[PDB]
């Protein structure tokens, strides 16, 4: 079968990439008991066993193969548009129940607060089980990831796509049951399956959304001021026990991929500048600062650093990365060196680097770090330490240095979620490990390495395969991959917080925690 | 062997790309008698029969494998910096001799006009042959491609890099011979060979330049007007054998990747606007136009189309392309269709596509072409016609439609040579096959398909492998790949043209030909 052969070919290619450019390989072997040859053979088997396999079947097989890595950065996308969608968003409470937190339809058969019990007579938990990955570890991050998929299936992601009618069994707030019959919003595949075509081929002849700007938390109280610009920021108050009020500032960091922020005008001042503006206002008109960082996909490390430099008046140690190398990385190293050869002054550093690297202040020390990074990469290469090098800080940055102008220095409370990845893992890790802020919520996802994408012509319809080129290592050791960061205060969302989207219990605890931060100082 | 295993792995990947996305495959088998499996098996053996193959060795093998396709578009570049360079430039004359046409170093022995005889006791010809590809066919274009590397060796291209001193045997124009000892300008490798590092790898534990703006031709006559922008363009007076003078425009199109033009300012107006300005000047102050398009690397098809649109007052038929298809191309087709789904008017087209596409004026006609393109691709896919599809015009443009404002409609003479690739192959072919211009010079290279690049992580140091995704077909059926485009008048550069860089013989003949075009007296004959 033409399809089978191409799938095997492409599978063998993905398999080779895992051996030459997947840094967390050793970790997955121990942490998950995963074996490359094992999975490979296993995947090869499903392909060879199928009777006249369809392209979509093969795509599913390769997608599951990569999914077996239990790595939120690692996945495969395909040139396929088939999809199925239902207009609802459901969230799981700490007690384990599922409620509709968002209804995007004019139908009133299902309302906010209603509880989801089953899908086609199967308890929600069973259905989610069919959406789990090959090496599911039962974490909340994995579960939430599956929940994203419950009512949105995409062939472009290698999902088996459903269609037609289905029944949703729900529980109304007064306790009784209703079975709601709905029909999936189906978009048929527009990219013809190779299998169907194969026989005729002749030889050629011559804001509950990740990255949401606003997020999903309501303001903590009467608002005295807000910004409404690019970032969602405002100032409210918290009243302690002695009856005294404290102006508290609020700011949400939706993503570390600034160019993708809602309403970003590339022809306007960069987002890090608007950030600085907000911080300044907060610096002299706020007592503490709550930073909502939940439901954040991560993004640019340099941008992550820029924001970190504006939240401290002291240097912050940064975790290092164990990298997997190829001569590609060697050339980058050589390029940093030739680029900074004659850099000896701050003036020259700004002319060579731009004085601003995605918001981060370019110092002579920056050039020095970049210089060190590269010498270290070259050293590792010559030493043969290329499978998983000794930790080297990204860009050579040993630590973050406070922004020269804006420096919020008052107490900070960072809210984390199981839907915080990469830079969204690193943000709390840096503030927590340096003791600059109080971390609250639930453990981050654990996407602990930088991502990179690979594209290549092929007939299996593979569009992109993202992989992980490094293994972040926290100061006291311990990887972030899978593990993520535990908050200082584990504060999950209750059924009461979620049901009507009020988060009253949740916000009340946070406001109290901020009070203690103001009064007890740290 | 680590290096060997990786080399074999990456070779196998390249070989697979050649069966899934290399449109000229069927053409190479017939034009070269080339065979994929066999060339692969041969490469594998070279890698397997090696003791401790170094990375650079394997890079050379992979580079030679792709070089065997005899495709100016197909090639591999590597993450390597080692290189050797000698500050000279040679040009081969029509009588087969090699002459120095440029010296780029302090006052030394070699003079412009010297004939290059040998390199280390070996005649130039033999040295050049060592630089040919596996399926070299002796075409002038392949000869020049090899000459480019005579004094420029790069590990980045898979070349073996020499170093140290070497002797150049030359002959002066008055006859005497001289042996000039010269030293290669060498840059050592900065990327450590993996073969050397392998044993310590432990398991992981927790001018004449192609694309030159000015080119190398001297002015054709006394200049009456000279443009001051990005393009070299002017107006001079050309006189016939009777002493009758005519005003003639001269314009050089250096490249079709407009963004790479010398001194291009991305913050200023696009080059097609300046081109338009020049043509308007030519339309009102000239009787004919000479376009120097020699030594041009090709570039953007849409930009090429914009320039053609300003050189005609009638539509020009375009050659179509036979394409190799994957679902990547299918998605493109679908997107064009969704993008133009509700476009039924000109204003609608301009809103969806912009007022112009890299200079080419946007119309409803353009929108309709793009939709037709999508349908034909989708139709080929559903029929299984995916290895080498029936001819389909790029972007669906069946023909070039005249620019609405600027249209040069007087006679045109285009100068071409063996160092014209892709769009530089296409420019003269469109003008020739539509009988719009007189094409003069030597046959173009023949990079007859669009290029695309592939990147992927590997331990062999491969940076990019460019391949060809289509085979262009001229109106009458001939392909462009390898064969190139023939001129109406074959006019090579003679030794007298080259010896002192005057090209007076070449230019005097170009002028006689232009006068005949202006005269409009029967058939245009050289003499």
User: Which string of DSSP letters, residue by residue, matches A239-300?
Assistant: E-SSS-EEEEEEEE---B-GGGSTT--TTS--HHHHHHHHHHHHHHH-SEEEEE--SB--B-
Q: Give CA angle at A371 (A402, A259), nearest 5°.
A: 55
> Could you tell me the two tokens for B257?
């990747």
Interface-testing mutation among A194, A200, A326, with chain B (most B C-beta atoms within 10 A): A326
Q: Which positions 84-143 of B are in contact with A (Cβ < 8 Å)? A: none
> Could you tell me the two tokens for A393?
């800080």
Calculate the alpha carbon distances from B449 to B27, B138, B316 in Å: 12, 21, 19
Q: What backbone torsions phi and psi does residue B440 show, to the nearest 5 degrees?
A: -130, 145
**Numbers of helices and strands, H then E, in chain A:** 15, 25
- Say which CATH topology domain B1-83+325-386 has: Histone Acetyltransferase; Chain A (1.20.920)
Beta carbons of B456 and A17 less than 8 Å apart: yes
Beta carbons of B197 and A382 less than 8 Å apart: yes
Contacts of B81 in chain A (CB under 8 A): 331, 334
A282 interfacial to chain B (CB closer than 8 Å): no
Q: What kind of experiment solved this structure?
A: X-ray
Q: Report helix, strand or coil for A469.
A: coil
Which sign does the torsion angle of CA A454, A459, A463, A466 carry? negative
- Say which CATH topology domain A207-324+387-522 has: 2-enoyl-CoA Hydratase; Chain A, domain 1 (3.90.226)
Taking the C-alpha atoms of residue A410 and residue A421, their distance in angstroms, rounded to an integer, is: 26
Instruction: Please report which helix (H) or strand (E) contains residue A5, including its range.
Output: helix A2-21
Taking the C-alpha atoms of residue B463 and residue B459, their distance in angstroms, rounded to an integer, is: 10
Q: How many CB atoms lie within 10 A of CB A339?
A: 15
**Numbers of helices and strands, H then E, in chain B:** 15, 25
Beta carbons of B457 and A79 less than 8 Å apart: no
Closest CA to B198 of B333, B6, B442: B6
Q: How many angstroms away from the CA of A50 is the closest CA of chain B?
A: 22
Q: What backbone torsions phi and psi does residue A37 show, to the nearest 5 degrees?
A: -60, -40
Beta carbons of B458 and A20 less than 8 Å apart: yes
Taking the C-alpha atoms of residue B421 and residue B257, their distance in angstroms, rounded to an integer, is: 12
- Tell me how long chain A is: 522
Taking the C-alpha atoms of residue A280 and residue A274, their distance in angstroms, rounded to an integer, is: 10
Contacts of A8 in chain B (CB under 8 A): none
> Could you tell me the two tokens for A81?
């548009």
Of the partner residues B20, B191, B455, the one whose CB lies closest to the CB of residue A459: B20
Q: Report helix, strand or coil for B235.
A: strand
A36 interfacial to chain B (CB closer than 8 Å): no
Q: Which positions 72-91 of B are in contact with A (Cβ < 8 Å)? A: 78-81
Q: How many angstroms away from the CA of A392 is the closest CA of chain B?
A: 14
A384 interfacial to chain B (CB closer than 8 Å): yes
A461 interfacial to chain B (CB closer than 8 Å): yes
Taking the C-alpha atoms of residue B485 and residue B420, their distance in angstroms, rounded to an integer, is: 9
Residue position matching structure tokens 């912009």: B354
A176 interfacial to chain B (CB closer than 8 Å): no
Distance between alpha carbon B311 and the CA centroid of its chain, in Å?
21
Give CATH for domain A84-190. Answer: 2.30.42.10
Closest CA to B426 of B485, B367, B361, B360: B485
Beta bridge partners of B1: none
Taking the C-alpha atoms of residue A71 and residue A469, their distance in angstroms, rounded to an integer, is: 12
Taking the C-alpha atoms of residue A437 and residue A234, their distance in angstroms, rounded to an integer, is: 19
B31 interfacial to chain A (CB closer than 8 Å): no
Of the partner residues B192, B384, B456, the one whose CB lies closest to the CB of residue A456: B456
A164 interfacial to chain B (CB closer than 8 Å): no
CATH 1.20.920.70 in chain B, residue ranges: 1-83+325-386
Beta carbons of A454 and B454 less than 8 Å apart: no
**Cβ-proximal residues to B210 (8 Å cutoff; 6+ apart), any chain:** B148, B295, B296, B297, B419
Beta carbons of A386 and B201 less than 8 Å apart: yes
CATH 2.30.42.10 in chain A, residue ranges: 84-190
**Cβ-proximal residues to B518 (8 Å cutoff; 6+ apart), any chain:** B246, B287, B288, B411
Contacts of A321 in chain B (CB under 8 A): none
- Say which CATH topology domain B207-324+387-527 has: 2-enoyl-CoA Hydratase; Chain A, domain 1 (3.90.226)
DSSP 8-state symbol, A362: P
CATH 3.90.226.10 in chain A, residue ranges: 207-324+387-522
**Cβ-proximal residues to A334 (8 Å cutoff; 6+ apart), any chain:** A374, A378, B81, B190, B191
B188 interfacial to chain A (CB closer than 8 Å): no
Helices marked H in B21-109 — which ranges?
25-32, 36-48, 55-67
Taking the C-alpha atoms of residue A45 and residue A400, their distance in angstroms, rounded to an integer, is: 49
DSSP 8-state symbol, B493: P
- Per the CB < 8 A criterion, the answer to whether B423 and B450 are in contact is no
Beta carbons of B326 and A454 less than 8 Å apart: no
Calculate the alpha carbon distances from B363 to A112, A205, B372 in Å: 49, 35, 14
Beta carbons of B384 and A6 less than 8 Å apart: no
Of the partner residues B26, B330, B331, the one whose CB lies closest to the CB of residue A206: B26
Q: Which positions 327-366 of B are in contact with A (Cβ < 8 Å)? A: 327-328, 330-331, 334
Beta carbons of B330 and A30 less than 8 Å apart: no
């Amino acid at each position: 079968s033409l399809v089978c052969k191409n799938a095997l070919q492409d599978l063998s290619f993905l398999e080779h990439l895992l051996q030459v450019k997947y840094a967390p390989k050793t970790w997955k072997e121990q942490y998950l008991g995963w074996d490359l040859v094992q999975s490979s053979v296993s995947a090869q088997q499903k392909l060879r066993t199928q009777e006249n396999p369809s392209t979509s079947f093969c795509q599913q097989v390769l997608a599951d193969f990569i999914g077996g890595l239990n790595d939120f950065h690692a996945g495969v996308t395909f040139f396929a548009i088939e999809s199925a969608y239902l207009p609802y968003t459901v969230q799981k409470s700490s007690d384990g129940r599922f409620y509709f937190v968002d209804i995007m339809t004019f139908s009133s058969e299902i309302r906010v607060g209603d509880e989801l019990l089953e899908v086609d007579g199967a308890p929600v938990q069973d259905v989610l089980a069919t959406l789990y990955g090959s090496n599911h570890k039962g974490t909340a991050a994995e579960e939430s990831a599956a929940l994203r998929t419950l009512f949105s299936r995409m062939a472009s992601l290698g999902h088996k796509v459903p269609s037609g009618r289905t029944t949703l069994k729900i529980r109304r707030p007064f306790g009784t049951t209703r079975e709601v019959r709905v029909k999936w919003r189906y978009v048929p595949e527009g990219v013809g399956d190779l299998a169907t075509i194969a026989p005729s081929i002749r030889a050629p002849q011559l804001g509950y959304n990740i990255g949401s700007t606003d997020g999903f938390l309501p303001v903590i109280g009467p608002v005295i001021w807000e910004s409404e610009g690019l970032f969602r920021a405002y100032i409210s108050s918290v009243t302690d026990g002695d009856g005294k009020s404290h102006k508290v500032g609020f700011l949400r960091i939706p993503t570390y991929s600034w160019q993708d922020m809602e309403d970003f005008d590339p022809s306007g001042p960069p987002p890090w500048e608007e950030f600085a503006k907000i911080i300044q206002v907060f610096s002299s008109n706020t007592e503490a600062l709550i930073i909502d960082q939940t439901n954040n996909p991560g993004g640019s490390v340099l941008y992550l650093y820029a924001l970190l430099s504006m939240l401290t008046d002291r240097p912050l140690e940064l975790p290092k990365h164990r990298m997997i190398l190829t001569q590609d990385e060697v050339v980058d190293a050589l390029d940093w060196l030739t680029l900074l050869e004659n850099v000896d002054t701050n003036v020259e550093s700004r002319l060579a680097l731009g004085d601003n690297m995605e918001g981060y202040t370019v110092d002579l020390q920056v050039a020095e770090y970049l210089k060190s990074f590269g010498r270290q990469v070259l050293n590792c290469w010559s030493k043969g330490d290329i499978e998983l090098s000794t930790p080297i800080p990204l860009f050579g940055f040993e630590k973050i240095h406070p922004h020269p102008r804006v420096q919020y220095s008052k107490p900070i409370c960072v809210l984390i979620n199981e839907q915080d990845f990469s830079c969204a893992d690193f943000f709390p890790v840096v503030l927590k490990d340096n003791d600059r802020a109080l971390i609250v919520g639930t453990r981050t996802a654990g996407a602990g390495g930088f991502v990179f994408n690979v594209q290549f012509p092929n007939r299996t319809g593979i569009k992109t395969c993202s992989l992980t080129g490094s293994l972040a290592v926290r100061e006291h050791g311990a990887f972030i991959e899978n593990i993520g960061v535990e908050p200082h205060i584990d504060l999950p969302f209750t059924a009461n917080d979620i049901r009507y989207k009020g988060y009253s219990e949740y916000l009340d605890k946070v406001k109290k925690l901020v009070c203690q931060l103001i009064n007890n100082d740290g």
